[PDB]
A paper describes a structure:
CD47 is another “star” molecule in immunotherapy field, expressing on tumor cells and delivering a “don't eat me signal” to macrophage to inhibit the innate phagocytosis once binding to its ligand signal-regulatory protein alpha (SIRPα) 9, 10. However, CD47 also expresses on a wild range of normal cells, especially on RBCs to inhibit the clearance by macrophages 13, 14. In this research, we generated a CD47/PD-L1 dual-targeting bispecific antibody 6MW3211 using knobs-into-holes (KIH) technology with common light chain design. 6MW3211 is a humanized bispecific antibody with an IgG4 format using knobs-in-holes (KIH) technology and the common light chain structure.
The knob arm is anti-CD47 heavy chain, and the hole arm is anti-PD-L1 heavy chain. The complex structure includes hCD47 extracellular domain (1-116 aa), 6MW3211-CD47 Fab heavy chain (1-226 aa), and light chain (1-213 aa). The hCD47 has a glycosylated structure at sites N16, N32, N55, and N93. The elucidated crystal structure contains one CD47 molecule and one 6MW3211-CD47 Fab, forming a 1:1 complex structure. The interaction surface between CD47 and 6MW3211-CD47 Fab had an area of approximately 637 Å2, and the interaction mainly involved β-strand C, CC' loop, β-strand C' and FG loop of CD47. Heavy chain HCDR1, HCDR2, HCDR3 and light chain LCDR1 and LCDR2 were involved in the recognition of CD47. Interaction modes include van der Waals forces, hydrogen bonding and hydrophobic interactions. Further crystal structure analysis showed that the N-linked glycol chains of N32 and N55 of hCD47 contributed to the binding of 6MW3211-CD47 Fab, which indicates that the selectivity of 6MW3211-CD47 binding to CD47 expressing on tumor cells may be due to the difference of N-linked glycosylation at position N32 and N55 between tumor cells and RBCs. The KD of 6MW3211 to hPD-L1 and hCD47 are 0.55 nM and 4.16 μM, respectively. 6MW3211 exhibited no binding to either human or rhesus monkey RBCs, while strong binding signals were detected for anti-CD47 control antibody Hu5F9 (Forty-Seven, Inc.), indicating that 6MW3211 may have a good safety profile in non-clinical and clinical studies.
Numbering used by the authors:
A (entry chain B): 1 to 213
B (entry chain C): 1 to 116
C (entry chain A): 1 to 226
């Protein structure tokens, strides 16, 4: 089979930068190479077919070139909505094969998180569990430190967090962290606090609530 | 599958202007030539191809004069055209294979050369 | 518009079989080859095969021969991919795909139209529907006149859940986070939205949670707290 190898694996660049990624095939594929764009959780979108032909609708800042075994895709002026993973696909011989993909992320300015905290709902407490959710909205860079405190005692081992993919409009990220306790352990305390450290904040931000208020 | 207005053979002399091998699809339905691929085979070799998707023709060196009239292709007309040099060098059976969307078909024409 | 709509996500026990469907619309179904490509989470896409709906010809990848079966129902404008003898490595998103307005090139000139994907998880664990709890807005979730609210979709297996807001009429400001895997092997995610805090008394916010593996559909009204 024809093996496809892309480089780099991931990539970071500012808005307006020229970005170039390379696809390489294990044998000549005679310009039968296609480029796809895929955003997380979405289906791929055809960008270029036959090395350099723009698929209808694709903005002109996308372009491809190459021959034999070496091909490149180039975005002339990188845009926020260009965040995605880009895949190449050889159309030369069966079975058709795809590259491993190049992730393209945007460099932008520092943006602080907006922080929100949510007590458990009565529905969940009725079931016997208490989840406290802390939300960090539209920040950059994507690293944020979240410290749960219960009656001013730092927690560890009872929370989980995930971070969104990069936003396709403002290039920010958002984070959600969930402290989970039993209804009993939850009721043994009063103050529930979420402390957030981030490059956009001049000092850590804390949001908190007293249980039963 | 595609259907043809068939023709057993055509004949030329050196008094011909251009040599034309006819090929006519009756049940043509394409709307853009991007939906069509035309291949002309002579003695096994692909001696002419038109890639409608890439708007790209291909002939080997000994058939440097071979062409089809792309403007006429959507009417069902895939007739091959060449000059006398290429034709008299390559007398015999020609295959016209037409692909349109998901359909395909072919037909055979014999090119005959008559000395006056 | 061309549109490829696929069947819902499924969980299958190892060894069983799955049949993903793909209904085409917006064009003449027999005019174009329907291909199938799958993508395991975190891996690259891989071609599986195609079918010519006109002459019913099919071609398969050598890796799936004996297991994969592509078929079409012309009157239904529907292609089908059926994979059998499922392994936990058949866990992937399965796509149907279609070429552009070209002659039948089977993907040599690229797949121009894709379905939305069908996530098939191969596992022996029993499917489990989610619980949906509200993340009510209050004084603790405001910020400069904006308010945050959401839904917590907790304890379900397998992925995925889809969350929409107000049956799709609310998309601006929505963040639906990637799921985390809890120590119990169940998934949990949150979906949030920011809205004006001023209109909390006049607007209505419902999250629509769909977990197709368990056929669970849940609408949760998120009422503000005071
Ligand atoms: C070659 O040309 C003839 C027409 O030219 C006549 O024949 C030459 C060989 C030459 O001897 C001249 O004096 C003549 O003027 C083509 O025959 C005509 O083809 C058209 C199109 O099908 C048809 O409508 C006419 O009836 C034909 N006339 C005839 C048969 O007398 C012939 O098809 C050409 N051959 C090739 C291979 O292109
Ligand atoms: C055929 O199409 C021509 C341009 O086609 C362009 O490229 C192809 C691959 C499609 O993606 C199409 O949507 C693009 O616009 C037209 O210039 C030409 O007029 C068309 N033919 C007819 C008869 O209208
Ligand atoms: C297609 O191309 C026409 C002319 O291009 C020439 O002829 C074709 C058959 C190819 O062999 C090409 O390499 C040549 O340069 C144009 O006049 C016509 O507008 C084009 N049509 C479309 C729809 O692109
Ligand atoms: C062309 O084909 C016919 C049968 O299809 C055959 O009788 C004839 O001899 C062939 N002419 C050639 C090969 O020149
Ligand atoms: Cl993380
Ligand atoms: Cl997002």
């Amino acid at each position: 089979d024809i093996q496809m190898t892309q480089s780099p694996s991931s990539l970071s660049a500012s808005v307006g930068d020229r970005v170039t990624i390379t696809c390489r095939a294990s044998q000549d594929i005679s310009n039968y190479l296609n480029w796809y764009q895929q955003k997380p959780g979405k289906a791929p979108k055809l960008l270029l077919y036959y090395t350099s032909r723009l698929h209808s609708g694709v903005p002109s800042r996308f372009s491809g070139s190459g021959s034999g075994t070496d091909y490149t895709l180039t975005i002339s002026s990188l845009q926020p909505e260009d965040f995605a993973t880009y895949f190449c696909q050889q159309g030369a011989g069966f079975p058709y094969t795809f590259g491993g993909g190049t992730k393209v992320e945007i460099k932008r300015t520092v943006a602080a998180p907006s922080v929100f905290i949510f007590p458990p709902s009565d529905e969940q407490l009725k079931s016997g569990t208490a989840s406290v959710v802390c939300l960090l909205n539209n920040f950059y860079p994507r690293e944020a430190k979240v410290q749960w405190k219960v009656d001013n005692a730092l927690q560890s081992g009872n929370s989980q967090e995930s971070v969104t993919e990069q936003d396709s409009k403002d290039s920010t990220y958002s984070l959600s962290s969930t402290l989970t306790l039993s209804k009993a352990d939850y009721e043994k305390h009063k103050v529930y606090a979420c402390e957030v450290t981030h490059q956009g904040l001049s000092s850590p931000v804390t949001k908190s609530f007293n249980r039963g208020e | 599958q595609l259907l043809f207005n068939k023709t057993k053979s055509v004949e030329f002399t050196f008094g011909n202007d251009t040599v034309v091998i006819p090929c006519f699809v009756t049940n043509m339905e394409a709307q853009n030539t991007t939906e069509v691929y035309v291949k002309w085979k002579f003695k096994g070799r692909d001696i002419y191809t038109f890639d409608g998707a890439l708007n790209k023709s291909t002939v080997p060196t000994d058939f440097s004069s071979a062409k089809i009239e792309v403007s006429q292709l959507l009417k069902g007309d895939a007739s091959l055209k060449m000059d006398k040099s290429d034709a008299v060098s390559h007398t015999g059976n020609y295959t016209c294979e037409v692909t349109e969307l998901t359909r395909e078909g072919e037909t055979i024409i014999e090119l005959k050369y008559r000395v006056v | 518009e061309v549109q490829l709509v696929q069947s819902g996500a499924e969980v299958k026990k190892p060894g069983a079989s799955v049949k993903v469907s793909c209904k085409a619309s917006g064009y003449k179904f027999t005019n174009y080859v329907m291909s199938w490509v799958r993508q395991a989470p975190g891996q690259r896409l891989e071609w599986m095969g195609y079918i010519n709906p006109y002459n019913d010809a099919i071609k398969y990848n050598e890796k799936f021969t004996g297991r994969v079966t592509i078929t079409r129902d012309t009157s239904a404008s529907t292609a089908y991919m059926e994979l059998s003898s499922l392994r936990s490595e058949d866990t992937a998103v399965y796509y149907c795909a279609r070429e552009g307005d070209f002659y039948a090139n089977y993907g040599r000139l690229g797949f121009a139209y894709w379905g939305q994907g069908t996530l098939v998880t191969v596992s022996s664990a029993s499917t489990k529907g989610p619980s949906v709890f509200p993340l009510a807005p209050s004084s603790k979730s405001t910020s400069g006149g904006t308010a945050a609210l959401g839904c917590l979709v907790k304890d379900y297996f397998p992925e995925p859940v889809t969350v929409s807001w107000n049956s799709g009429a609310l998309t601006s400001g929505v963040h639906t986070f990637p799921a985390v895997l809890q120590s119990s092997g169940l998934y949990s995610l949150s979906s949030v939205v920011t809205v004006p805090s001023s209109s909390l008394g006049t607007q209505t916010y419902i999250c629509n949670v769909n977990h197709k593996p368990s056929n669970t559909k849940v609408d949760k009204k998120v009422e503000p707290k005071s």
